[PDB]
């Protein structure tokens, strides 16, 4: 969660309909768009994030939320328009006798601005004396594991969330929507609607 990736898919329309319906969803909410009519708008670029969170911290990644994950690992602004896409990963992110491969930042000086990724491995000071590169009383380590185990409750299930950030700026749009077709009725006076001409 402290080092979230970002992809930029563009230059063609959005056809998110072959995702095998994503049987485990558990979370489907759209803030500023309607799920029914969503492909009728042309967008420039679409961004998506990738991270893993616990079960008791799913409702923390939302505009207008405070805490330790929503302020020190990932924060979204108040002006956001998109949906929520996430699923459970309890059968994959768990091994025998505990799984320790995920880290998260807990201690920091101030909060993170929206769209800010920090991969600093520096020590944090909680007093008035320098750490001098050695752990002591007023110097702790701001990184720890998660202790993901399969034998747990519904508040430990890992949720891989993908955050769509549809963007339409001041340039040729590229992520539009898919189109259909009919057959070719010949020798009949009927209406025709091609790409540009009617």
């Amino acid at each position, epitope marked *: 969660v402290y080092a979230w990736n970002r992809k930029r898919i563009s230059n063609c329309v959005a056809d998110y309909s072959v995702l095998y319906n994503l049987a485990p969803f558990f979370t489907f909410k759209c803030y500023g768009v309607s799920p029914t009519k969503l492909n009728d708008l042309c967008f420039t670029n679409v961004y998506a994030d990738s991270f893993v969170i616990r079960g008791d911290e799913v409702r923390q990644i939302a505009p207008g939320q405070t805490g330790n994950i929503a302020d020190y690992n990932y924060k979204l602004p108040d002006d956001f328009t998109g949906c929520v896409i996430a699923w459970n990963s309890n059968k994959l992110d768990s091994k025998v006798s505990g799984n320790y491969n995920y880290l998260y930042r807990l201690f920091r000086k101030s909060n993170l601005k929206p769209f800010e990724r920090d991969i600093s491995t520096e020590i944090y000071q909680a*007093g008035n004396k320098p750490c001098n590169g050695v752990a*002591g*009383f007023n110097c702790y380590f701001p990184l720890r594991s998660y202790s993901f185990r399969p034998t747990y409750g519904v508040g430990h299930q890992p949720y891989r969330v993908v955050v769509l950030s549809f963007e339409l700026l001041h340039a040729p749009a590229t992520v539009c929507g898919p189109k259909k077709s009919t057959n070719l009725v010949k020798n009949k006076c009927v209406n025709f609607n091609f790409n540009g001409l009617k």
Partner: antibody, heavy 123, light 109 residues
């Protein structure tokens, strides 16, 4: 006044499990710490026995870390201490201490102390 | 682990004088994690001097700390008798935290 309440005396058998607590309100800032020091009648202090609530990193002495264990709890803000294999050498007074810490930074020394807990094992 | 060896065991003086107690160590410790404490027989200990340069709240303006590097000492401005108890020193710089034996002060008669 910021104070730390501690339990009272307790008598046990020669060898059992003892649990001494130290409840406070500063233990809900993810950065507070609390130590457990033992002092006998006339004898000076013995060890440190500290624990940091949050990122649990335990560190005991040489004689310790074999029959003692310290846990933490941030929900109620009460510390715990378990000491097994009680023999006829632990007759002393246990004290509690925790420095005043804020929500982002702590102090630079132990300010507030506890009351005391007398443990005696006899008939 | 670092140990503390307090040289002054018993030092009796008269009310209205100056007393000097010291608490040194074996090796060289950092002069940023030193703390002095005061404990009354039959009561709870309290903080007296933290950091060896700064004083605590409520402490009168008579406990002055000195020494750095390997030897530390505590000086008294005026011996007004209200704290004739045993003092202790703590070096909370390394991982093993140790203490001293004890410095008791009595009244001369």
């Amino acid at each position: 006044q910021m104070q730390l309440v501690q339990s009272g005396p307790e008598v046990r058998k020669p060898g059992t499990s003892v649990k001494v607590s130290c409840r406070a309100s500063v233990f809900s800032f993810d950065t507070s710490a609390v130590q457990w020091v033992r002092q006998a009648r006339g004898q000076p202090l013995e060890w440190i026995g500290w624990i940091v609530f949050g990122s649990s990193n335990t560190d005991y002495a040489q004689k310790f870390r074999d029959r003692v264990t310290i846990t933490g709890d941030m929900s109620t803000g009460t510390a715990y201490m378990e000491l097994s294999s009680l023999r006829s050498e632990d007759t002393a007074v246990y004290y509690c201490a925790a420095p005043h810490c804020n929500r982002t930074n702590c102090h630079d020394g132990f300010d507030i102390w506890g009351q005391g807990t007398v443990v005696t094992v006899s008939s | 682990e670092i140990v503390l060896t307090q040289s002054p065991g018993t030092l009796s003086l008269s009310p209205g004088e100056r007393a000097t107690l010291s608490c040194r160590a074996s090796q060289s410790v950092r002069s940023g994690y030193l703390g002095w404490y005061q404990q009354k027989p039959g009561q709870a200990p309290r903080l007296l001097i933290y950091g060896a340069y700064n004083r605590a709240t409520g402490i009168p303006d008579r406990f002055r700390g000195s020494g750095s590097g390997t030897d530390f000492t505590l000086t008294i401005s005026r011996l007004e008798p209200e704290d004739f108890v045993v003092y202790y020193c703590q070096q909370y710089d390394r991982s093993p935290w140790t203490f001293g034996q004890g410095t008791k002060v009595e009244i001369k008669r």
